[PDB]
């Protein structure tokens, strides 16, 4: 009738073999003696056993932790349990921290986000406006500080880096346009600075971060480049500028996925030749990378067709809103609206959709603002009304599902989204006098 | 106490602009302006507006307490109960030592001040409603369980005691000699403990029915406020023990 | 009857098969990444570039058809 | 005393479909002619071949998707029956301990890594074509399913120790009995006191290394008393081990574990089921075509390489310390079956 | 050598929360089966574990992971088993397969947010618009367009109350930019006085519409806020446009304004609003602070640019705005959550913003240069503060000369402002 448990007493447990069957006021001094106030063993996390009980009583079993401890003062100690049934609340007020040093950081890096686009702003309305070479020497002092500052944190934050390099593209575009004295030619080398900054941090990136914000700036930059260096070279109007703008954005979102699965450095694929390749198999390094480079190509995606949203608004707004032009161009500015707007049922992201579903919103916006910039004050408030239209349009759609839920018809649809892309470019022919020249 | 250094900076700035002191012009804006700041200097308009609230007085459901009484106190069994100003995540705002000498039998009580919205959402996952009552008892027998555990007997009371007659409420600069040392036929003793019991910090407050270092409260809340049974903090700030 | 093309076991020149491999593979990635099913049983990135292609083409011919009546 | 076991029959696990998957073979390369330019002018071309590509990407998709689908399967039937070794901890109390019969397909095997199991399903493609060549990417694409999906990734493996008779075992003498703690730990945790035994041979072995075995159930013999415990098999020599274990060889199997290095390894046998591990100093030259029983696994930082000519046979090895095979040992002394 | 915590083992229905008695100095693996068998029956290796943090390994006792007598200590998982990443090598099923952890479907859901932010892109930009029409030609057509579109966002937001109330409150928060463009286009004169008047008046009544007809938070910190800034413009411009003149005296009574809603912030707060329902009264009380307390930063920074914009500036001015300044940095030590904190500390910002801005538009670009100067040394410090944490047990003495420097400086300003506005040499 023997019991073998583990005692504990410095609480290294021994390993004892007890009798069973006899109370515990004679086997307490050899457990003493043995290990090592009435003490007593108890189960852990319990109250010590009655001292005159056998150990077959309790129901102590071979493999039991015993714990040598003193019997208290008469109470059981009950061990009262309350019943609680929203705990997720409790680890929600541990996750939720005070003020502390974390959010210490947050501000800081606001107020630095804060300082660049202020000094950006206020350095360039005193060259702008009025004022001698002192204030294009802050931007330019903002801008490589910001580009050093960029560049120097790419390993100790990662979050901050891409902020302040995000941050850093204002002071920089800002900095090579008044820069060098004139005028325009000078969007040439402010568009170089943009393109050249947004395609060094797209360099050492992570997964993210390398968002639509970085490579819709880089074409951007790329494709107002492309068009200012037919500008400062040579000298072309408005409806060159305008139909050069618009035909780079349709070219660079038509041929968007295709970019961005060349841009997105896939691994490329190993098709054989007829004759005796035997080629070696992708190894199991860069095919667990793989889901690193899906959503670097998504980002990619989103910004290559943000890019052509803003390059195809970007010369849409320099084609129609100088003063009366040809209704070509107010129909080659229809047709790249109705166009980004039709290209909405091809993909399947959201951010894409979102983007050129919302090109005519921001056509409608820029038109609004050049009409003001521009003193007219007429055909800005035809501007509203389309942009009530366009807004009325979305809530019709949004509180009625049954309009918004897609055989012939989509098929009629779809030639449409087809024929107006066609008819683009021969009406671009039309615009500019290049049959004319012929 | 910014507004009395704001009022006393603006007739000291009064008085100092007033240097032509002819045609008693710049003379009376002068003695306005010394016979002023020698009222708001400031630990005499307190005086005047304790004792118009005192006229005043001649003419809750968020903190909730619990109280012990324990007939064996010790100062041995007061590590135990300070330890319950932040336990077992329910942040009790105040533990209340009182020891009452009336006559020759020092009755001694503790009384613990659960809060409602210090530990808010520590009570939201209780029930969809709070139950704070329904834990402050919780607390209480847990330290009923854990004083009656290491020796000493407790029994929870409901209906405690009068502090005040429905008589002299002091308080003292915190220690020893004087909370032994505090006749008359009724005395009254408390201690009260609160914020984080790594390093707690106390109040202590006296009634009889100035001794050695007491000091006399003028204007009653101090005595209201010194039954167990009381949800408050027995004004007068605390010390770092 | 035929010879079909085979080569018993024991440069670099692409081919026409490898050429039109490889513009497949590069149409159900971007197919991929774009309409998110590389079913390919229509795929709507070759209209939209044909539909371009075919607008280049039209201002191709009318200037070369405004050239012979110059 | 002890409490009691009674066999409650096994709960019934994902079942594996070890078949056979078959996969049509690629098309054999159509080909297509330049476009005879006056047909480039006009407006089986590329469309034709290049619908056929889509149509057999589509259907490999599909067989991908199949394959899938059983590797997933395999390896929630070896994850349900080969744990790792911190949930079998809550394994000996519950109704799942002593379970596998002698009848299951995994039956005394003891886990002991995880690494890259070979996919029980056959993933065979039918072809008949001599040397014809085939089409570019349809046979690229093939290609590559069928040397990617055709391994499983790390999956948890096992020592077939039904079948083996004997192991050596060569590493630092305190990561390797890491590896005999786990396994061994796995062989008392599954299978019953009425199936296997375990004796053991150590020189310091009441020292918090070896002691852990104290409590087991397996360790005892039928009806000796010896005092404290029954007969325990935790004897210092290897030859007295074989005296206390005249009665019990002569079919509940055992795995009579030796750890010291020196005093006649294997002096049991050269049996039937006594797989004597047993752990050594060094490596050896050139050693006879390494068996498929009596083998030689090095246990490495984190991998357990078997000898063959270095084929390190498992990707990352279970370690389980002395006091975690404490705990399982003394959590599992109370049932006796 | 024990100590007593208390486990929470929620995951059978609810919880159950248990004091206990854990030995010390033994390690997690021996007495893990001790609480759960107190706490669960009164199966992945579970493991107690500090409530926000990870769980504890069972290699370590309770003595060397540190745990106080008296914590609560839930009872989690071991952290986690080993993944297995799905692989593919198929670089189109690659891209279909994933990019799933995208929730790329458009849906009936992704239309509404579209809307309600083109509605409220639209609000915006006919008020710019419009503005921009009348703020440079002479016409009644911006009047009448603000005041269709203003009219139109007051009935679409009020009306769609009971439907949506995450548009409707974000509705009424833009609703009150036409609203504000509005009331400060009537009888046109030359901008007069009181057209600011009439817009802090109609700001004023729409925040205390739409906050006494709120349901519930998110939308009552920034009605709070503007509610109490459009009081406080109304009440200075109701001595600004009936009682006096008020040359500067404005700049000294909005910075007393601020002033008197900072550090009253809590008695105007309680103001504002058996066991009830307090985690919403909580909520809506902290809203309220945080709203309090914005309006006193506002209000700060206009009169602290009302002071010190234009030349010849007295230097009384240019000490009280960075009295009031520090005084406003320094009150953030006071107040525990986090939101008050950051309006209090970033008003020396939004100041050196403002005056920046002031600068620009007053068209002087000598001083802006200065402001960009002290804006670079408000975020030098804010950068010193934050590289190397130094948390307020430093910087049980010195804690009490900052109180006093700032119950001093908080005083400082009050004769000051009495002195600039000339009330003393009466």
Known sequence: PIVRVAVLAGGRLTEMALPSELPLREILPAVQRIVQVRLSLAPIGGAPFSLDATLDTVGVVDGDLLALQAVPSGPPAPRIVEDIADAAVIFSEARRRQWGPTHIARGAALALIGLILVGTGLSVAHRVITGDLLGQFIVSGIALATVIAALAVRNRSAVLATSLAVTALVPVAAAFALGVPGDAPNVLLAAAGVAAWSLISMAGSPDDRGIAVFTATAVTGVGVLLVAGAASLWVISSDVIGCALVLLGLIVTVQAAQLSAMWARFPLPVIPAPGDPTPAARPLSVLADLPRRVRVSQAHQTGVIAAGVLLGVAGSVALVSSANASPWAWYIVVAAAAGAALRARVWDSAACKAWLLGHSYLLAVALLVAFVIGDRYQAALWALAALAVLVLVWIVAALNPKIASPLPMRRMVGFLATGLDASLIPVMALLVGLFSLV | MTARIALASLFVVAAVLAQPWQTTTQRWVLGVSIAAVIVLLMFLTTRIGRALAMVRRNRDAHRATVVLRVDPAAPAQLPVVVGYLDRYGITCDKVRITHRDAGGTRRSWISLTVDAVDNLAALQARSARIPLQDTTEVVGRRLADHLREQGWTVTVVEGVDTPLPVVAAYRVKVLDEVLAEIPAEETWTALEFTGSPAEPLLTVCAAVRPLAGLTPARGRPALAALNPLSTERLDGTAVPL | RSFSSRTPVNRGFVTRHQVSGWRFVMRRIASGVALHDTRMLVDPLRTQSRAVLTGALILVTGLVGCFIFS | SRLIFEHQRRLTPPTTRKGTITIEPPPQLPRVVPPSLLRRVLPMRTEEVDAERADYLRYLSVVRDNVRAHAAEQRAALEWSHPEPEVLATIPGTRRQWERDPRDRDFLVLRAGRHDVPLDAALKVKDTADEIDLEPVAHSALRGLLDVQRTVRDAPTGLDVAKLARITVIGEADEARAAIRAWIAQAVTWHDPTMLGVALAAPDLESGDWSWLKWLPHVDVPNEADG??????????????????????????????????????????????????????????????????????????????????????????????????????????????
Do not use: F
């Open chain 4, 228 to 337: 404290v415990g029954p007969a325990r098999y935790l004897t210092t020599s290897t030859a007295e081990l074989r005296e206390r274990l005249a009665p019990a060889l002569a079919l509940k199997h055992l795995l009579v574990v030796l750890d010291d290095p020196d005093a006649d390894p294997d002096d049991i046998a050269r049996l039937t089921g006594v797989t004597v591990i047993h752990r050594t100093t060094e490596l050896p030259n050139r050693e006879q075509y390494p068996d498929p029983e009596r083998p030689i696994l090095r246990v490495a930082d984190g991998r357990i390489e078997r000898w063959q000519v270095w084929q390190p046979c498992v990707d990352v090895a279970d370690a389980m310390s002395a006091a975690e095979a404490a705990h399982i040992a003394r959590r599992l002394s109370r049932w006796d079956s």
